[PDB]
Amino acid sequence: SDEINELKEMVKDEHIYDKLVRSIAPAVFGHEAVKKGILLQMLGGVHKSTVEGIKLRGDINICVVGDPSTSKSQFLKYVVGFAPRSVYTSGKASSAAGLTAAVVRDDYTIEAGALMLADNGICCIDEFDKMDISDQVAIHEAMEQQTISIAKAGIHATLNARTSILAAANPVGGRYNRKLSLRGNLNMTAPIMSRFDLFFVILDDCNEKIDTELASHIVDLHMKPPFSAEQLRRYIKYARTFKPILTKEARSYLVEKYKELRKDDAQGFSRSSYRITVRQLESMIRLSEAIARANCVDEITPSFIAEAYDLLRQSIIRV
Amino acid sequence: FRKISRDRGIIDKIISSMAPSIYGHRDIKTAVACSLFGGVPKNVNGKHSIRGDINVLLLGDPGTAKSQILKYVEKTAHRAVFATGQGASAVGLTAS
Amino acid sequence: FDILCVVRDLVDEEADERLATFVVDSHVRSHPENLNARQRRLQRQRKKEEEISPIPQELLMKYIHYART
Amino acid sequence: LSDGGVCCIDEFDKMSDSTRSVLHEVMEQQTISIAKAGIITTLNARSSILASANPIGSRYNPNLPVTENIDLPPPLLSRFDLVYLVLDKVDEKNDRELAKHLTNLYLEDVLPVEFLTMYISYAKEHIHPIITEAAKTELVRAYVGMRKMTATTRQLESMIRLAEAHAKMKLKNVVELEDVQEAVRLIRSAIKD
């Protein structure tokens, strides 16, 4: 009942949403957008099964692009330390089999890889860009169909990989080139970039007003947030029990905002899309559901659609 | 089945019913319908056997429901198997 | 592969309008919360299904198997 | 196996690529992730590494940067706190005195070489330095200075760790301004390579 009352005093607070984001990764300074994304990943979308049997992904996939100078791996260390049912792995150290699932003797049988172990969970892939394309393309099924399917050595299976993937890619050459598109800064391509719900780029050029307080924070951390980790986890567990619904106004407004992103993504005389596929409309649905969970309301207001549209625009204004 | 088969629009109602929660792509739904019903396998006096199965390739851009169409067909076909990309070895596909 | 389907994702304003409308409708139509109770729920599922499937999917599977065999 | 001890690696330039990748999570997280045969664990390595590496070919070219001479890639090279160059370039005022020092070992029988291990042991057992409040401002101003001169927070973290190590030396229980200053100075020498 003490925990019940802490939950009540948390949901009573009208602006708890800010307090949640500032409770993400408290040992790392700044980068509010990334922290907001990690909150809206531990709060997933609502997974759905259609009348035709076709599934819709609930999990949210996030990429954190950053130079090896940036405090980037801190987010992976945090969420794997915090979130239940999660794993850490390194991009080149893990193969395609090592990532989805391998086939081993004991007979022939299946050995669970990282994306199997993080089912109904979070998989954190550090140094993602160094992963070979052969290793990257293996996860295209687990990314979106939420499964791994195998046909090898007389063992045939399809395996559940309902997993929110968190990738920490470096830019090509380490340095992020601000003159180039997000497409140009990575060795990824549209099949896998469309599978991520959103990309964050986090940059660390010198700025004395920032660098002074950032340096001070590093020494403060060596001991010269509003909620504890326990309280945040309890809230996340409670918020995940909510299953928000799109209000009628939100549906039409979301169609308009998708048409805006879709229009702005068009390139070439063919009006080819690149970043905004149909997958990104569904990404906005997932993100607004996660936002509604963050606010513990069973109905999605158009303000959440506006926030989801702006969250995707953190990537779309960089092309 | 005998009743609904008489309908003048039955091919189109079947095709529209293929993967009903996927918008558009009536060409894909047609190709899937043709594949899923199949042709007639034939054998000419036992001296020459001919394929009845229809093979279909869904080639195209990301986020266009191709994988979802295949998962639907796995749902709908009376004997089905599904194997993505790097998950399929040569002997794991034919025999070992 | 004796049928080829080429699937191009082109920006096209009213086509994207219609597709996005259908997708958001599909998401609410697939939401989990959306005479005994089990019978009523199966009836509601059929009511949802006839919005988009001109013949029942359960009928379509047996019809396919019949036509094949 | 080098948990709690210095891991000495020679031929560090000729290291294999899987090993080059594996070094990242011991450099950062001091562990290595294992996920096979029904066992999943971050196997904690907790080791300080002393690397020894080489140029391509027989000679180092000091008119080219470290990345151009050495085989191993910059992001791994960046993780080291101190990085040094030792060169065979001829100079009799060095070489003659080196040769005399070397050759004199064959004739001769303060240098606390056997007490060094005991001093290290008691220092590691007893002394746990904490950062002085003034040393915060010293670290910040030094970091912003080298930042005004391409630094990253990894350099600041390195200066903290070196200053704490400097405080275990002299058996000092609190990091002083002079500890920060020597950590800063030695890193300023190193980062200029």
Ligand SMILES: Nc1ncnc2c1ncn2[C@@H]1O[C@H](COP(=O)(O)OP(=O)(O)NP(=O)(O)O)[C@@H](O)[C@H]1O
């Ligand atoms: N016409 C559509 N109607 C409904 N959903 C769609 C449509 N096109 C794409 N989607 C959604 O897009 C998501 C991805 O579908 P998917 O089948 O993986 O596309 P794909 O063609 O396989 N792309 P890729 O795997 O990169 O080659 C699914 O959640 C679908 O619901």
Ligand SMILES: [Mg+2]
């Ligand atoms: Mg696909």
